[PDB]
Amino acid sequence: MGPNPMKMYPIEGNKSVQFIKPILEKLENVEVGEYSYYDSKNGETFDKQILYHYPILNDKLKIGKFCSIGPGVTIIMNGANHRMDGSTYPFNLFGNGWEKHMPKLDQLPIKGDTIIGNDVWIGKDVVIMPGVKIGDGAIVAANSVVVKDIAPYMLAGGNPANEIKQRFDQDTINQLLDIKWWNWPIDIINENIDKILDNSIIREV
Amino acid sequence: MGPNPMKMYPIEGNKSVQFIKPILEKLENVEVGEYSYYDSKNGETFDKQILYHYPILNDKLKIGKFCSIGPGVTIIMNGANHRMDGSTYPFNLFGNGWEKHMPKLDQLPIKGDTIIGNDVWIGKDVVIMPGVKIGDGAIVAANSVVVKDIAPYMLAGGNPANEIKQRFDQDTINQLLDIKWWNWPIDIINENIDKILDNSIIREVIW
Amino acid sequence: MGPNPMKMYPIEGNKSVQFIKPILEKLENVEVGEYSYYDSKNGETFDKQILYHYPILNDKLKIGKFCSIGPGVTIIMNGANHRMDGSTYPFNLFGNGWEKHMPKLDQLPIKGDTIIGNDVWIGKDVVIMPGVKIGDGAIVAANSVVVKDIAPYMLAGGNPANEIKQRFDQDTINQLLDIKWWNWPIDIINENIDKILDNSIIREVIW
């Protein structure tokens, strides 16, 4: 019951809704969760949505399970950070004698890994900046520019994106982070979808 | 005198500027004013800029007259709101048995309809969110994201968009909201464009 | 040593990165510095990134030297401002008798010249509005919408962009502003690229 999480394109006949895991497996420094899908903008594959990601830099991108990524969402890793101790001008880029002035890896600023929780909804055209972490259950409004962390089960938006409000009271939130239904076996989940959909799954747990 | 409001491309030999009524009118749950235009960004027709609008959700989009809509402006309707009382994951979308957990219309509430007033100037690449109302005379800055209502004759901007300032004093605005020149027959408007252009149209009618 | 600032495409076999100066020699009321470059988003030339620039209005765009313009940066000039003392509707635009209502230059808003300093790093998809000045050494974060001036050596971002942080303390900034290494004959620059890169240039030139 349910789609094949190994299938790149879960909906037969439809090449717009895609499962990220299959696609990003061929890539390094990227761990993706089962059932997270990307809703193509112009029929593009989610791998083009990840910019400036280089193995040599070693920063990682992690995405949880049951994530809904809207069309146009872009993820910016650290490969485009400029050295900022002095001038930001990439002299080395233009060779002809300038390559000699090339940064040492420890000279380029790395803001860290980018982590996206489970059951996270990212609206369309959302831009996510280097080294950000979006907690489980969070909802990132459309056209947001995420530059700082967002807390679990928080509704957020803007440029810079800011937390607007908690999706539920703290105890309801607290419990969901404990249950972690997204880590339940496919069959147990398939047997509680509706309780998970209306948050009533909390009571029986 | 003046263009034909029924023409899709008012300006001869020009496929960039379009009159929005001829185009949208052809659609469901949409009302548009006669002279409002759209300055195409890449040649697209304004109908391509209205996203997630589904008859079944029954939300309407209203656009007044004499509106200036910049290129790339995007209007988001309620067709893509995920259920939110629990998980936001669209299980039903992937069928294969998950289609039974499909939302019942009353589990997908909406804030309201989207209404853009008359004589509104919306800058380029502005994104308009569901259930928002923009007042007559308002000016929305380029690249703004409208998430809440904007009052009549206000200057607003940003992401989220915020009201920056009032365009005129309160009386000029209330007088204007009264006169509603955009509602006059074409012939009477043609006679005062300059007065409507410099706002002196208030002293002629009012006084 | 160092690239020829006159080459449109400095990096051999690579039509993505361009030196803005040679590429914009043709445009009017535009001044650009020698090593400023653009990082093309989809192959487009930078001249395509400057919008609503009409000589008639006479506003100018100035871009200093050694600037890093990220892909998709958009510079909006004054040719897009509507008349605002009354209706913002551009009747004159549709002709058919309406052209007569065409604005006299002095009736049209015009925020001034746009000025980008030296050694300025402008992030991806940044939109620069009209009449804005960006000080030397500033860094603009990707996706910002710059509506107001940005002081020298400041870190700014958002929509509207706000100054987030001073890169260095005031005296270091002032020294850098006084030294102006970007105005040095390239020979001298070439022998100090590394001191310019770690800021040790201040210590040697000031004391």
Curated annotation (Swiss-Prot), chain A:
The active site is at H82. CDD domains: LbH_XAT. Coiled coil: none annotated. InterPro entries: Hexapep, Hexapep_transf_CS, Trans_hexapeptide_repeat, Trimer_LpxA-like_sf. Keywords: Acyltransferase, Antibiotic resistance, Repeat, Transferase. The keyword Acyltransferase applies. One of its GO terms (biological process) is response to antibiotic. One of its GO terms (molecular function) is acyltransferase activity. Its EC number is 2.3.1.-. It is an enzyme of class 2 (transferase). Homohexamer. Belongs to the transferase hexapeptide repeat family. Inactivates the A compounds of streptogramin antibiotics by acetylation, thus providing resistance to these antibiotics. This is Streptogramin A acetyltransferase. It comes from Enterococcus faecium (Streptococcus faecium).
